[PDB]
Amino acid sequence: GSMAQTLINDTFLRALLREPTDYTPIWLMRQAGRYLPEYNATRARAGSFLGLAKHPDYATEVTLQPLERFPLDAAILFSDILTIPDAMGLGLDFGPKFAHPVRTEADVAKLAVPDIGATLGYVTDAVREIRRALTDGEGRQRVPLIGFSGSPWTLACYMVEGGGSDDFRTVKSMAYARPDLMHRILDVNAQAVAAYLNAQIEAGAQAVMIFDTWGGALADGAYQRFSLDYIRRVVAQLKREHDGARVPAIAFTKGGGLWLEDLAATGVDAVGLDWTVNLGRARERVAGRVALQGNLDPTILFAPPEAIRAEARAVLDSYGNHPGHVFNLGHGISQFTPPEHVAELVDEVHRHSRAIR
């Protein structure tokens, strides 16, 4: 009779849709990561970061690790944003480096949307396996699964740079010097990101997140032309429903607090925020049009437990007693974070938000 397997805990999906809930749900960027000794042990068995991402059993294993420690309200597919340019044939290795950086008109001409099934089957296989792993003995799902991609601009940054960077000055200078080529890269990336996210949804992702980690490096004007317009192009092409449920879409431009209204008008269900943004003011700014995700400074997780819990209370109090907040950090968990500080954060967010709500 029911549309899908029983989801025991769906508060995360409900908050992204601005629905009534009993508490504020929480998941954390890099919840699978080097701060967990078991992640490092698994990474050692796999041989490398890419080994973990490219084999669905390893990807599934590390995705589930934080859920065994903490009562988080969602799982996020373990992968990397750079799977797409790898599938485009740029030769990813592990920061990240490409054997073939995108520099010339001829390089750009060779870019094409990958056949997602044929080149990135390992990602959809991980999504399928994680959905099976999140199922208990009675067939019920424990928590929802988040699928994800880099934004067209953020992918372009790595593609043109030829790997990681601290400022991506080389790609930004290409946007000003050769805007036509830049737009061509962004066009192909947007088509690829939509295809990739849609494939993840079909495989069982129940929400999707677009990580525009480097959008905040761009000047006003440039941000809209080279990043935001392409986020909109992706969202316009996304499946918005699957298995009888809305599939919420989230966009996060780190450093993008000035453009919240712009992001909230792209068609996404939710916008991610970093710690510089006043969460209550942001809620007013969007006037309930979208859910907000964030926005604790991850550096707070180095402070004592009483400080961590007080700061978690302050974030929640800033948002206030209204639907539509998913608690998260404004960036990923540091590799040096004590896991018990994550436990304390999750506990306080749950208890204090229940007291509010």
> Contact positions toward Na ion, by CB under 5 A?
11, 21-22
Under 8 Å between Cβ of 176 and 168: no
- 97-98 and 92-93 strand pairing: antiparallel
Under 8 Å between Cβ of 246 and 186: no
Specify the residue, 22 or 243, whose C-beta has the smaller distance to Na ion: 22
Under 8 Å between Cβ of 308 and 344: yes
Specify the residue, 20 or 139, whose C-beta has the smaller distance to Na ion: 20
> Distance between CA 81 and CA 206 in Å, rounded?
18
Rounded least distance, CB 74 to Na ion, Å: 13
Strand-pair partners of 292: 271, 325
Rounded least distance, CB 319 to Na ion, Å: 16
Under 8 Å between Cβ of 312 and 345: yes
Rounded least distance, CB 336 to Na ion, Å: 33
Element holding 261 (H helix, E strand):
helix 260-264
Strand-pair partners of 148: 209
Identify whether 103 is a catalytic site residue: no
Grouping H, G, I as helix, E, B as strand and the rest as coil, residue 183 is helix
Specify the residue, 15 or 59, whose C-beta has the smaller distance to Na ion: 15
> Which among 35, 58, 158, 223 is annotated as catalytic?
158
Q: 112: how many CB neighbours lie within 10 A of its CB? A: 12
Rounded least distance, CB 325 to Na ion, Å: 12
Identify whether 230 is a catalytic site residue: no
C-alpha separations of 190 from 141, 187, 209, 227, 247 in Å: 31, 5, 14, 10, 19
Identify whether 30 is a catalytic site residue: yes
- Whether 34 has a binding-site annotation, put simply, is yes
Specify the residue, 11 or 198, whose C-beta has the smaller distance to Na ion: 11
Rounded least distance, CB 283 to Na ion, Å: 19
> Which among 73, 80, 86, 274 is annotated as catalytic?
80
Identify whether 142 is a catalytic site residue: no
> Distance between CA 225 and CA 175 in Å, rounded?
10
- Whether 331 has a binding-site annotation, put simply, is yes
> Distance between CA 158 and CA 324 in Å, rounded?
33
- Whether 131 has a binding-site annotation, put simply, is no
> Distance between CA 228 and CA 104 in Å, rounded?
24
Specify the residue, 21 or 200, whose C-beta has the smaller distance to Na ion: 21
- Whether 31 has a binding-site annotation, put simply, is yes
C-alpha separations of 241 from 133, 143, 201, 244, 299 in Å: 22, 18, 9, 7, 36
- Whether 33 has a binding-site annotation, put simply, is yes
Specify the residue, 151 or 293, whose C-beta has the smaller distance to Na ion: 293
Rounded least distance, CB 271 to Na ion, Å: 21
Closest residue to Na ion, Cβ-based? 21
> Which among 14, 43, 131, 233 is annotated as catalytic?
43
Please give the positions annotated as active site. Answer: 30, 34, 43, 80, 158
As annotated, the binding site for substrate includes 30-34, 80, 158, 213, 331
As annotated, the binding site includes 30-34, 80, 158, 213, 331
